[PDB]
């Protein structure tokens, strides 16, 4: 049995990974209960390569609503929460699957106090994103390019701007007229990308994070039947406004390392016969 | 036997970095107005190596408090806030300088409402952390190891635990009795470490983030002159309790790909 | 000197042994060949003949891939592969007048056409990660001499004819995906039959029994 001997340079390489989502900004709520040197491997080969591909991103917001105890006139919380989405699109080469996960940070928190009766209407917190705040849309894919995002030297994304608009939400009061929250738009402009790896005991779970800056644009948002009026932003009541997905489309270039299929180490005479 | 690559090899290398802090969970407040393919570089030569060294993490929390206009009985927030620390220590006959940043996530917020009269005490949000929360501590150093953390394969850390207890905050009411918040303590055990890089335009900016998991302990914490029930956790009023620094000790092993 | 010489139709199929090492699913040990038997019925000369054929290999080459000592990393210590050096041996037993009078022969020979054998695809099952595969591989068999031999099956000894076959390697390449290995040449021992039940060879054999 001939034995093919191993060559001088080591065959070290990438480490097992599972692509997934990143961390999130979260916060619960508690309501009251009453009302009133060593070397581990030898040398190895690696080359720097460029991967420039188109990226299509589809995202969707999500919202959570929590009403307090009592007669039911007043709400405790109306806020944002992460949302996920998946789809298939077509690079000029092939069809590719995609997942995404939206989230926010630096959010502003507004409140309104109609009165101190059981009947009166109060909302203790409704959120709104604005200039200072940001939006992070994480991403992972099945194509070949995403298999070599580990060990990245540089990464830059050219992306288009998008506009998100506010829908409308109706406060179902037991008795009397129904006030309503309506409108509010913010526009996303791209900012830098962020990569991240969490070293748990046996898998390097990893993720990207496309940051996105915000600017404020008309229409305004308003709460009807109240004194709060004509303020800018995107309330959390109905951000999607009846659309299944908002989209961003553009290019991304990465410069990374790659295991070198150097082509020299080969069993001599590896060829067709002659 | 097998063929061998013999030509002169090229020089790819690490990319410029600046070590710093990561992102942070933040949220402002608005108060009412009234009151009522191509190869870029050629084949190169790399190697895999161990860097295993000790570590002393020193940190300290920080709180924010804000009142609401009016008679002065209504607070609107007693919350947490990231904090920084700069220190020096010795490790195997070497003085290392270091910077550390402490933030907290997963907060559980509370509330009290003594009534609606202008005079009644009210605190709309005082936040604690109680087994559903994590404290994330970020650390950077001046040693050689941290220079080669770029392109890491596996990092692990065996670190000792540290108990953090609360102090006391004596709320100031214009007239009458002063109530006070007192108590609480948690134990910070270790969990997975995180490494995160930000490819901004100028230069990459990276961040390490040790992540710790809390577990509640005694003593219990309480708010005087009310009905709040001897709850458990660490109140954000005076978290460091007159101590300049909390500290943790340990060892960390990383396995990194360094240029040869 | 009673003479027997007949048309003949061989059929056969390789077989492999895979043995992984313990826990975490990463580090295999052996991916090797082993003999294999096939039984069939065909018609020749307007008669129906049953047959039993056993295929074995010798002169095999041993390759290896070592991704590192660290646990999580992929390792396969020995996967065999065939090339121009190696020889194939296929043996054949029939049920007819001839192979009753195949002991005490004076001359054996045979003319046989050729065949191609191609690899398939084996999917290593890693618990976490992307599944590296092993694909490709081709080879072509060209005839050689004939000899007497005996194959033992089901506790009944049997007398048969052993054909030898020399090899010539040909394209496609064989490659391990998700690694630096690529563009190697030969027939690996992962999935040689490629789902195909039987490769078949045909020809004629000449025999002068005594």
């Amino acid at each position, epitope marked *: 049995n001939v034995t093919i001997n191993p060559g001088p340079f080591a065959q070290t390489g990438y480490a097992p990974v599972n692509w997934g989502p990143g961390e999130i900004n979260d916060s619960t709520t508690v309501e009251p209960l009453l009302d009133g040197d060593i070397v581990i491997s030898k040398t190895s080969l690696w080359k720097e390569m460029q991967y420039n591909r188109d990226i299509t991103i589809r995202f969707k917001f999500a919202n959570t609503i929590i009403k307090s105890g009592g007669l039911g006139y007043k709400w405790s919380e109306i806020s944002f929460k992460p949302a996920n989405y998946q789809y298939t699109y077509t690079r000029d080469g092939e069809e590719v699957t995609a997942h995404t996960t939206c989230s926010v940070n630096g959010v502003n928190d507004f409140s309104f106090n109609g009165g101190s009766l059981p009947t009166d209407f109060v909302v203790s917190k409704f959120e709104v994103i604005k200039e200072n705040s940001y939006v992070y849309i994480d991403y992972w894919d099945d194509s070949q390019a995403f298999r070599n995002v580990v060990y990245v030297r540089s990464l830059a994304a050219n992306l288009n701007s998008v506009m998100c608009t506010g829908g409308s939400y109706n406060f179902s009061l037991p008795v009397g007229q129904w006030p309503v929250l309506t409108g509010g738009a913010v526009s996303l402009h791209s900012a830098g990308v962020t990569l991240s790896t969490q070293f748990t*005991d046996f898998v390097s779970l990893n993720s990207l994070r496309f940051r996105f800056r915000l600017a404020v644009e008309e229409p305004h948002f308003k709460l009807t039947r109240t004194r709060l009026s004509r303020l800018y932003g995107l309330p959390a009541a109905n951000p999607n406004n009846g659309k299944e997905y908002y989209e961003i489309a553009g290019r991304f270039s990465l410069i990374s390392l790659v295991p070198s299929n150097h082509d020299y180490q080969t069993p001599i005479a590896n060829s067709v016969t002659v | 036997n097998v063929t061998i690559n013999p030509g002169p090899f090229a020089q790819t290398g690490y990319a410029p970095v600046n070590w710093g802090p990561g992102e942070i969970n933040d949220s402002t407040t608005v108060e009412p107005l009234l009151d009522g393919d191509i190869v870029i570089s050629k084949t190169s030569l790399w190697k895999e190596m161990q860097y295993n060294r000790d570590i002393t993490i020193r940190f300290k929390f920080a709180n924010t408090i804000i009142k609401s206009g009016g008679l002065g009985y209504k607070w609107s927030e007693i919350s947490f806030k990231p904090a920084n620390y700069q220190y020096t220590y010795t490790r195997d006959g070497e003085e290392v300088t270091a910077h550390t940043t402490c933030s907290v996530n997963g907060v559980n917020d509370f509330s009290f409402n003594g009534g609606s009269l202008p005079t009644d005490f009210v605190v709309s949000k005082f936040e604690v952390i109680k087994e559903n929360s994590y404290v994330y501590i970020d650390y950077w150093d001046d040693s050689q190891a941290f220079r080669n953390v770029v392109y890491v394969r596996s990092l692990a850390a*065996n670190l*000792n635990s540290v108990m953090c207890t609360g102090g006391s905050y004596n709320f100031s009411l214009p007239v009458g009795q002063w109530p006070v918040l007192t108590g609480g303590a948690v134990s910070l055990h270790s969990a997975g470490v995180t490494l995160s890089t930000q490819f901004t335009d100028f230069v990459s900016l990276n961040s390490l983030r040790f992540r710790f998991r809390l577990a509640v302990e005694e003593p219990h914490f309480k708010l005087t002159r009310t009905r709040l029930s001897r709850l458990y956790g660490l109140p954000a009023a005076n978290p460091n309790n007159g101590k300049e620094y909390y500290e943790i000790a340990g060892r960390f*092993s990383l396995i990194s790909l360094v240029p040869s | 000197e009673m003479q027997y010489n007949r048309d003949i139709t061989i059929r056969f199929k390789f077989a492999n042994t895979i043995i992984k090492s313990g*826990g975490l699913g990463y*580090k295999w040990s052996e991916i090797s060949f082993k003999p294999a038997n096939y039984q069939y019925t065909y018609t020749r000369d307007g008669e129906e003949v049953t047959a039993h054929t056993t295929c074995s290999v010798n002169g095999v080459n041993d390759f290896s891939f070592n991704g590192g000592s660290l646990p999580t990393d992929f390792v396969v210590s020995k996967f065999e592969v065939i090339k121009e050096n190696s020889y194939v041996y296929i043996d054949y037993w029939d049920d007819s007048q001839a192979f009753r009078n195949v002991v005490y022969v004076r001359s054996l020979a045979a003319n046989l056409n050729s065949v191609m054998c191609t690899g398939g695809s084996y999917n290593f099952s890693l618990p976490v990660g992307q599944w590296p595969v092993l694909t490709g591989g081709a080879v072509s068999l060209h005839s050689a001499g004939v000899t007497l031999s005996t194959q033992f099956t089901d506790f009944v000894s049997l007398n048969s004819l052993r054909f030898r076959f020399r090899l010539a390697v040909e394209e496609p390449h064989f490659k391990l995906t998700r690694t630096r290995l690529s563009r190697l040449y030969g027939l690996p021992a992962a999935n040689p039959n490629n789902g195909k039940e039987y490769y078949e060879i045909a020809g004629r054999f000449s025999l002068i029994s005594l």
Partner: antibody
Amino acid sequence: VQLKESGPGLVAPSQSLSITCTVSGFSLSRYSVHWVRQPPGKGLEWLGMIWNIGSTDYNSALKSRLSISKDNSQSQVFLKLNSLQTDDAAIYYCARNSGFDLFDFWGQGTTLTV
Amino acid sequence: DIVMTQSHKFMSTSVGDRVSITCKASQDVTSAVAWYQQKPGQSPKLLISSASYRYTGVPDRFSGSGSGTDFTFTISSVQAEDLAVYYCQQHYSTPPTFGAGTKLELK
């Protein structure tokens, strides 16, 4: 959890040495192991440690003389010491780590004769 | 490296009387000191993991204290199976370093 050792017991100077600690109940991809020894009638000592990740750390003095190794396939760990002395005679223990350097569960311990 | 010492190698107490042990350190190990117990024909066991915290299931009659350099280990009432050696470890540095080993004898 159960930690068991296995070793020769009698050895000659200027030779090698190999001990094997076989673990069960806990995975060596979730914990680390330590080796310690007890000079007869003298304070106990630290020899070496093997981590969760595969990396190893040694005592300064016997750094030159020992090697620590493991195999998740045999769910076992092993140590080798070479060019020993008469002074190296002692009882040897393999232990688990929980925090920084806290030892939690210990083995029975083999004694050595040189 | 780190260096530790224990005061005596024998301490004598009848069933029911306070035992008290001390071990000093060569530097200010901040609250990182442990205590192990080794009975005859037994493998050591972990009792007081941090200077004061008791690990897992250990009786209550054990406890510890100390801060800075000086550290102590105290039993309130003695029993018949407590006659064993006790070691004090130090875990704030690379070489974990035990003490000499002080034990008890009965009167």
